[PDB]
């Protein structure tokens, strides 16, 4: 009678189901997940000189909205914008707002440079509003000045202000145009004369006229202040010629370097690191794919429309 030697392989009691090219329900001894389903509900900021803007909107950093008083200058590698952040305390909007916000969120810092703009005795440069409260009192955008006639009703004087870029890098200059609520208000602030504001550099020009059309109240205000911007190149100058309606810059901005802009509601955590962020928080997975969100920033796993994709790490399970 012959002796016997038998060749065999292992098996497990609890096998795992995977998909193959030919079988949707193939049982293997072990498998591992390739799609990340979990996220840390926090912004993992270790190893990052970060700035959390809070209720400050990125554009508010350039104009100096009261909510942005602690964010007027700085440096960072990561900038965090939040939901319902305030840019415009006084009602209005910025022309080419989306391009501006992206420029700020792409940057690694903001510096400020004095324009040196000064005004004669017949201009009141200290115009304020209840819309922009500071220290429990009427105030204004910190980087701008609301110019009005010193004496109510009198013609605002024909004025020229020139900012010279004496730096080696481009400077971002912003200004506003006030659009009064009525002819009577317009006359009180700037006089009965026809108003005209012109702005001119070597690479930009535009002209503006305050409009006095009827419109509804936004936080009790029918007036509007709309913002405009341009880049003043190194060695160039920009000339403002105006006779009422200009909201004039006290300072210009310089965007420094590059950084990662994040839009999220999750709280900061300096205890841990991450390279991938989304609205709900951070993704610290080693896996190649994820199903949390198609909207991510940084160095991320690729988004897929799948709950799970199990990769086999063992042979076919053929139990006893």
């Amino acid at each position: 009678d012959p002796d016997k030697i038998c060749l065999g392989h292992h098996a497990v009691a609890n096998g795992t189901i995977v998909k193959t090219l030919t079988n949707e329900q193939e049982e293997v001894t072990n498998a591992t997940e390739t799609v990340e389903s979990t996220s840390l509900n926090r912004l993992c900021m270790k190893g990052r000189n970060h700035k959390d803007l809070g209720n400050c909107h990125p554009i508010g950093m350039l104009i100096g909205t009261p909510a942005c008083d602690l964010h007027l200058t700085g440096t960072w590698d990561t900038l965090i914008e939040r939901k319902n952040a305030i840019a415009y305390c006084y009602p209005g909007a910025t022309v080419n707002e989306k391009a501006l916000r992206q420029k700020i969120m792409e940057s690694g810092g903001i510096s400020k440079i004095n324009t040196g703009f000064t005004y004669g005795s017949s201009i009141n440069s200290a115009g304020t509003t209840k819309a922009c409260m500071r220290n429990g009192g009427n105030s204004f955008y910190a980087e701008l000045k609301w110019l009005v006639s010193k004496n109510k009703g009198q013609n605002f004087p024909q004025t020229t202000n020139t900012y010279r870029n004496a730096d080696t890098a481009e400077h971002l200059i912003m200004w506003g145009i006030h659009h009064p609520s009525s002819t009577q208000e317009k006359n009180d602030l700037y006089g009965t004369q026809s108003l005209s504001i012109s702005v001119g550099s070597s690479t930009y020009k535009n002209s503006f006229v305050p409009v006095v059309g009827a419109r509804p109240q936004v936080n009790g205000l029918s007036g509007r202040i709309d913002f405009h911007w341009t880049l003043v190149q190194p060695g160039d100058k920009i000339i403002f010629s105006h006779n009422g309606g200009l909201i004039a810059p006290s300072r210009v901005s310089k965007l420094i370097g590059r950084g990662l802009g994040i839009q999220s509601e999750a709280p900061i955590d300096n205890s841990c690191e991450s390279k991938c962020f989304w609205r709900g928080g951070s993704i610290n997975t080693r896996l190649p794919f994820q199903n949390l969100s198609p909207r991510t920033v940084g160095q991320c796993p690729k988004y897929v429309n799948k709950k799970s994709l199990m990769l086999a790490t063992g042979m076919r399970n053929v139990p006893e």
Binding site: P2, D3, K4, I5, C6, L7, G8, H9, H10, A11, V12, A13, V18, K19, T20, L21, T22, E26, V28, T32, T34, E81, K83, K98, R101, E106, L260, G261, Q263, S264, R279, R286, L287, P288, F289, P294, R295, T296, V297, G298, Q299, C300, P301, K302, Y303, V304, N305, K306, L309, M310, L311, A312, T313, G314, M315, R316, N317, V318, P319, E320
Partner: protein, 172 residues
Amino acid sequence: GLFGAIAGFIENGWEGMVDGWYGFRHQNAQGTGQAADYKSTQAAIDQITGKLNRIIKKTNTEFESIESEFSEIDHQIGNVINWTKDSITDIWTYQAELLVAMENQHTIDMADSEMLNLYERVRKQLRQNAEEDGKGCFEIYHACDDSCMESIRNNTYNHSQYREEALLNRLN
């Protein structure tokens, strides 16, 4: 399967074999035993480790936002971005599904091949002293004690020593 051993001529796996992926069971006049095969097990594990090293990773490309979370976007560009992102998602979803399906097929068949390669090594070792039973076993036509069984397992079995006895037993 592709190589015919795992879920093939080997009827089932061994749940008792906890120290290896492939191995041996023997029966002789003195008793029975079980032992794992190191080289075949490690060959299979190293290949799976290799796949995991290639697959479990992300790209180092840094992406920035082209869709505002807390603000409106332009309608035309927003529609283009939505179309593009959904097209890219369909590609990556498809690629992920194909990757894992293809890799799983290859892992299963690779494991099958290592089982067969061990079986084939043993067949050629035994030469004319044993015959295949069709179930992954070899019936050995001479007395093969524990030391003899060990020599088969560690690839030092010399057929010529037992050939005279084995041929007389095989031809009857």
